Amino acid sequence: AKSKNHTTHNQSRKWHRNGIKKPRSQRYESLKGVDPKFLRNMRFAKKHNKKGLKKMQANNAKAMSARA
RNA sequence: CGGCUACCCACCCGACCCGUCUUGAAACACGGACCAAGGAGUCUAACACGUGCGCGAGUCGGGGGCUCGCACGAAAGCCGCCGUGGCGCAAUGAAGGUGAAGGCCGGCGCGCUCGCCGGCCGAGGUGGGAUCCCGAGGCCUCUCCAGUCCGCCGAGGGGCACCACCGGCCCGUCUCGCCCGCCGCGCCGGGGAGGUGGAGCACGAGCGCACGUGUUAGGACCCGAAAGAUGGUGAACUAUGCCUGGGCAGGGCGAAGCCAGAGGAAACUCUGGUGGAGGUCCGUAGCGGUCCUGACGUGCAAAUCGGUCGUCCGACCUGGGUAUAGGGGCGAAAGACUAAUCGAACCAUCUAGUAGCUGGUUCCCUCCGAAGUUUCCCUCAGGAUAGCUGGCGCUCUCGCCCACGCAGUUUUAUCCGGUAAAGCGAAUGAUUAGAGGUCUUGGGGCCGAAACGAUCUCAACCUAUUCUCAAACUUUAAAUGGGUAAGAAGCCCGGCUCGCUGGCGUGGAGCCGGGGUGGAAUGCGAGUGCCUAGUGGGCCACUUUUGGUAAGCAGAACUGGCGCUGCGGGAUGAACCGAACGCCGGGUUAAGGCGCCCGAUGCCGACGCUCAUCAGACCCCAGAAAAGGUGUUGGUUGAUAUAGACAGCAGGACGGUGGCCAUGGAAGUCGGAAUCCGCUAAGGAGUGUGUAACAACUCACCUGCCGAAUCAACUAGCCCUGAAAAUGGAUGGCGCUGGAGCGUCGGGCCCAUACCCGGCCGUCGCCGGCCUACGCCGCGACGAGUAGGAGGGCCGCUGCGGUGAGCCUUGAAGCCUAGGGCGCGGGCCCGGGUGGAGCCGCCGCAGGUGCAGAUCUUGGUGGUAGUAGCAAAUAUUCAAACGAGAACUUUGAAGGCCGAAGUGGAGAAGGGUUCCAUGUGAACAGCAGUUGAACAUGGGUCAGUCGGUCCUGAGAGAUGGGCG
RNA sequence: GUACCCAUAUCCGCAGCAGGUCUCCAAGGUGAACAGCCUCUGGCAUGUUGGAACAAUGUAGGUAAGGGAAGUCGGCAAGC
RNA sequence: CUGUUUAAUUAAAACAAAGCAUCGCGAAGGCCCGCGGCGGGUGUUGACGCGAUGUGAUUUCUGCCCAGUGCUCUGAAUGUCAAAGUGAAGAAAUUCAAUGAAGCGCGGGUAAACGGCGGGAGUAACUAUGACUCUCUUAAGGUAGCCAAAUGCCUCGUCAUCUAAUUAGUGACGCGCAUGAAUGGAUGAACGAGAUUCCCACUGUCCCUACCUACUAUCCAGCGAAACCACAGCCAAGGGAACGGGCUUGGCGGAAUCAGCGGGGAAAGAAGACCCUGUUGAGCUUGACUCUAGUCUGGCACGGUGAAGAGACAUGAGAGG
RNA sequence: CUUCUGACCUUUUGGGUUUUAAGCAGGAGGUGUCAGAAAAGUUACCACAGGGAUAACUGGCUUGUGGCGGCCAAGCGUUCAUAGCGACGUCGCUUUUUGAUCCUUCGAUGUCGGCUCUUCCUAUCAUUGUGAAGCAGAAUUCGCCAAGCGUUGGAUUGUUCACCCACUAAUAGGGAACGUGAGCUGGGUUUAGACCGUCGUGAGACAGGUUAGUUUUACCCUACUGAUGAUGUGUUGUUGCCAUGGUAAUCCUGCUCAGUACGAGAGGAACCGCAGGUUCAGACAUUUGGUGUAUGUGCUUGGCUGAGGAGCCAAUGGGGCGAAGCUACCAUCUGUGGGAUUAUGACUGAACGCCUCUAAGUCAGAAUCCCGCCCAGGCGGAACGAUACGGCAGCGCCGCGG
Ligand SMILES: [Mg+2]
Ligand SMILES: [Mg+2]
Ligand SMILES: [Mg+2]
Ligand SMILES: [Mg+2]
Ligand SMILES: [Mg+2]
Ligand SMILES: [Mg+2]
Ligand SMILES: [Mg+2]
Ligand SMILES: [Mg+2]
Ligand SMILES: [Mg+2]
Ligand SMILES: [Mg+2]
Ligand SMILES: [Mg+2]
Ligand SMILES: [Mg+2]
Ligand SMILES: [Mg+2]
Ligand SMILES: [Mg+2]
Ligand SMILES: [Mg+2]
Ligand SMILES: [Mg+2]
Ligand SMILES: [Mg+2]
Ligand SMILES: [Mg+2]
Ligand SMILES: [Mg+2]
Ligand SMILES: [Mg+2]
Ligand SMILES: [Mg+2]
Ligand SMILES: [Mg+2]
Ligand SMILES: [Mg+2]
Ligand SMILES: [Mg+2]
Ligand SMILES: [Mg+2]
Ligand SMILES: [Mg+2]
Ligand SMILES: [Mg+2]
Ligand SMILES: [Mg+2]
Ligand SMILES: [Mg+2]
Ligand SMILES: [Mg+2]
Ligand SMILES: [Mg+2]
Ligand SMILES: [Mg+2]
Ligand SMILES: [Mg+2]
Ligand SMILES: [Mg+2]
Ligand SMILES: [Mg+2]
Ligand SMILES: [Mg+2]
Ligand SMILES: [Mg+2]
Ligand SMILES: [Mg+2]
Ligand SMILES: [Mg+2]
Ligand SMILES: [Mg+2]
Ligand SMILES: [Mg+2]
Ligand SMILES: [Mg+2]
Ligand SMILES: [Mg+2]
Ligand SMILES: [Mg+2]
Ligand SMILES: [Mg+2]
Ligand SMILES: [Mg+2]
Ligand SMILES: [Mg+2]
Ligand SMILES: [Mg+2]
Ligand SMILES: [Mg+2]
Ligand SMILES: [Mg+2]
Ligand SMILES: [Mg+2]
Ligand SMILES: [Mg+2]
Ligand SMILES: [Mg+2]
Ligand SMILES: [Mg+2]
Ligand SMILES: [Mg+2]
Ligand SMILES: [Mg+2]
Ligand SMILES: [Mg+2]
Ligand SMILES: [Mg+2]
Ligand SMILES: [Mg+2]
Ligand SMILES: [Mg+2]
Ligand SMILES: [Mg+2]
Ligand SMILES: [Mg+2]
Ligand SMILES: [Mg+2]
Ligand SMILES: [Mg+2]
Ligand SMILES: [Mg+2]
Ligand SMILES: [Mg+2]
Ligand SMILES: [Mg+2]
Ligand SMILES: [Mg+2]
Ligand SMILES: [Mg+2]
Ligand SMILES: [Mg+2]
Ligand SMILES: [Mg+2]
Ligand SMILES: [Mg+2]
Ligand SMILES: [Mg+2]
Ligand SMILES: [Mg+2]
Ligand SMILES: [Mg+2]
Ligand SMILES: [Mg+2]
Ligand SMILES: [Mg+2]
Ligand SMILES: [Mg+2]
Ligand SMILES: [Mg+2]
Ligand SMILES: [Mg+2]
Ligand SMILES: [Mg+2]
Ligand SMILES: [Mg+2]
Ligand SMILES: [Mg+2]
Ligand SMILES: [Mg+2]
Ligand SMILES: [Mg+2]
Ligand SMILES: [Mg+2]
Ligand SMILES: [Mg+2]
Ligand SMILES: [Mg+2]
Ligand SMILES: [Mg+2]
Ligand SMILES: [Mg+2]
Ligand SMILES: [Mg+2]
Ligand SMILES: [Mg+2]
Ligand SMILES: [Mg+2]
Ligand SMILES: [Mg+2]
Ligand SMILES: [Mg+2]
Ligand SMILES: [Mg+2]
Ligand SMILES: [Mg+2]
Ligand SMILES: [Mg+2]
Ligand SMILES: [Mg+2]
Ligand SMILES: [Mg+2]
Ligand SMILES: [Mg+2]
Ligand SMILES: [Mg+2]
Ligand SMILES: [Mg+2]
Ligand SMILES: [Mg+2]
Ligand SMILES: [Mg+2]
Ligand SMILES: [Mg+2]
Ligand SMILES: [Mg+2]
Ligand SMILES: [Mg+2]
Ligand SMILES: [Mg+2]
Ligand SMILES: [Mg+2]
Ligand SMILES: [Mg+2]
Ligand SMILES: [Mg+2]
Ligand SMILES: [Mg+2]
Ligand SMILES: [Mg+2]
Ligand SMILES: [Mg+2]
Ligand SMILES: [Mg+2]
Ligand SMILES: [Mg+2]
Ligand SMILES: [Mg+2]
Ligand SMILES: [Mg+2]
Ligand SMILES: [Mg+2]
Ligand SMILES: [Mg+2]
Ligand SMILES: [Mg+2]
Ligand SMILES: [Mg+2]
Ligand SMILES: [Mg+2]
Ligand SMILES: [Mg+2]
Ligand SMILES: [Mg+2]
Ligand SMILES: [Mg+2]
Ligand SMILES: [Mg+2]
Ligand SMILES: [Mg+2]
Ligand SMILES: [Mg+2]
Ligand SMILES: [Mg+2]
Ligand SMILES: [Mg+2]
Ligand SMILES: [Mg+2]
Ligand SMILES: [Mg+2]
Ligand SMILES: [Mg+2]
Ligand SMILES: [Mg+2]
Ligand SMILES: [Mg+2]
DSSP secondary structure string for all residues of chain A: --------TT-HHHHTTS--------SS---TTS-HHHHHHHHHHHHHHHHH-HHHHHHHHHHHHHH-
Stated in angstroms to one decimal place, the resolution of this structure is 3.6
Q: How was this structure determined?
A: cryo-EM
Which nucleotides along chain B are within 7 A of a protein C-beta? 103-105, 111, 126-127, 164-168, 194-196, 370-375, 380-381, 387-389, 405-408, 484, 489, 494-501, 508-513, 527-528, 537-540, 554-561, 563
What are the residues whose beta carbons fall under 8 Å from the beta carbon of A14, sequence distance 6 or more?
none
Amino acid identity, residue A3? S
Angle at A63 between CA A57 and CA A67, to 5 degrees: 145
For A1, the 3-state DSSP assignment is coil
CA of A61 to the centre of ligand 21 (A): 125
* HSE-up of residue A13 (Cα within 13 Å, Cβ side): 3
Angle at A15 between CA A14 and CA A21, to 5 degrees: 150
* HSE-up of residue A48 (Cα within 13 Å, Cβ side): 6
Q: How many Å is the Cα radius of gyration of chain A?
A: 27
